[PDB]
Design a protein around this ligand. Structure first.
Ligand SMILES: Oc1cc(O)c2c(c1)O[C@@]1(c3ccc(O)c(O)c3)Oc3cc(O)c4c(c3[C@@H]2[C@H]1O)O[C@H](c1ccc(O)c(O)c1)[C@H](O)[C@H]4c1c(O)cc(O)c2c1O[C@H](c1ccc(O)c(O)c1)[C@H](O)C2
Ligand SMILES: *[C@@H]1O[C@H](CO)[C@@H](O)[C@H](O)[C@H]1NC(C)=O
Ligand SMILES: [Cl-]
Ligand SMILES: [Cl-]
Ligand SMILES: [Cl-]
Ligand SMILES: [Cl-]
Ligand SMILES: [Cl-]
Ligand SMILES: [Cl-]
Ligand SMILES: [Cu+2]
Length: 235
């Protein structure tokens, strides 16, 4: 159970974005239905009034929280991967449009899941803004909690993989457009009951065997990390 508070750009806090530049749902409940329209941008998918200005090559940092800003972020039980996708705003996140900019699942060296590192990072994870056409975009940040993912929602609606999905409205101003945005995948649609990483038993299967759901990260992606960029308590 987690939500996005706002974003940072190049380590500068853009301020509380809830219902402003984030398409915030009304609470931190997970999405579980893989075929639902709620998979696109969660349960209150509507245009919100602002779009955060960035440039190609900037660091865009999502900041998550549980109940209040810079709290425990998400329950430690919620082991799983983190991804970020992009789509053009005109698309309104419909069609084969979502392009993957980032994936982190399990880090064998530190023996940590993406979610564990997100807690340590005070809820912060980043992407580098790619050299796509200037204009308006949606960035879709997605946490998959696997603690009940030994079952499929479609078979048992009490259980399933849990999706914490947040869409940010981002405007890219300066960019030379040298890596024009390629075909992506639909949400809902890309994840099905047979997709690797959707049904998984984190209790019995080694984390080193986990494969995150496709698609792969776009070659045009410029980078990203789970790491604290800014200190929320210095406000
Ligand atoms: O006079 C305006 C001018 C606006 O641009 C807007 C206005 C009013 O109201 C708003 C709006 C939305 C929610 C609110 O609660 C509200 O009070 C006002 O509604 C919408 C609803 C929309 O569907 C879209 C809006 C807006 C914004 C947006 O601020 O703005 C876009 C826009 C307008 C003029 C531009 O020069 C431009 O580059 C982009 C698009 O027309 C349109 C839009 C979409 O068609 C599809 C989308 O996925 C999005 C959209 O806008 C959002 C947007 C929001 C603020 C911006 O500065 C901006 O550039 C774009 C965001 O890109 C998501
Ligand atoms: C899952 O979502 C689909 C598409 O909206 C809907 O038809 C189906 O009823 C949903 N399942 C449940 C259990 O609500
Ligand atoms: Cl659901
Ligand atoms: Cl309105
Ligand atoms: Cl960190
Ligand atoms: Cl550029
Ligand atoms: Cl690619
Ligand atoms: Cl980064
Ligand atoms: Cu939860």
């Amino acid at each position: 159970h987690t939500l996005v508070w706002g974003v940072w750009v190049n380590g500068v806090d853009q301020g509380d974005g809830r219902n402003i530049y984030i398409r915030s749902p009304p609470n931190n409940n997970p999405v579980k239905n893989l075929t639902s329209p709620d998979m696109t941008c969660n349960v209150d998918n509507r245009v919100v009034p602002k779009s955060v200005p960035v440039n190609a090559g900037d660091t865009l940092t999502f900041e998550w929280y549980h109940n209040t800003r810079d709290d425990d972020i998400i329950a430690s039980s919620h082991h799983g991967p983190i991804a970020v996708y992009i789509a053009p705003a005109a698309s309104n996140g419909q069609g084969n449009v979502w392009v993957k900019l980032f994936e982190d699942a399990y880090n064998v060296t530190n023996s940590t899941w993406a979610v564990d590192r997100l807690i340590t990072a005070h809820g912060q994870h980043s992407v580098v803004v790619p050299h796509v056409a200037p204009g308006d975009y949606l960035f879709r940040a997605e946490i998959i909690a696997l603690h009940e993912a030994d079952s499929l929602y479609s078979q048992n609606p009490i259980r399933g993989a849990q999706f914490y999905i947040s869409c940010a409205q981002i405007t890219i101003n300066s960019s030379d457009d040298s890596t024009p945005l390629p075909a992506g995948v639909p949400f809902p649609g890309a994840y099905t009951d047979s997709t690797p990483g959707i049904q998984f038993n984190i209790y019995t299967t080694p984390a080193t065997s986990y494969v995150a759901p496709p698609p792969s990260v776009w070659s045009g992606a410029l980078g990203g990390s789970i790491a604290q960029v800014g200190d929320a308590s210095l406000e």
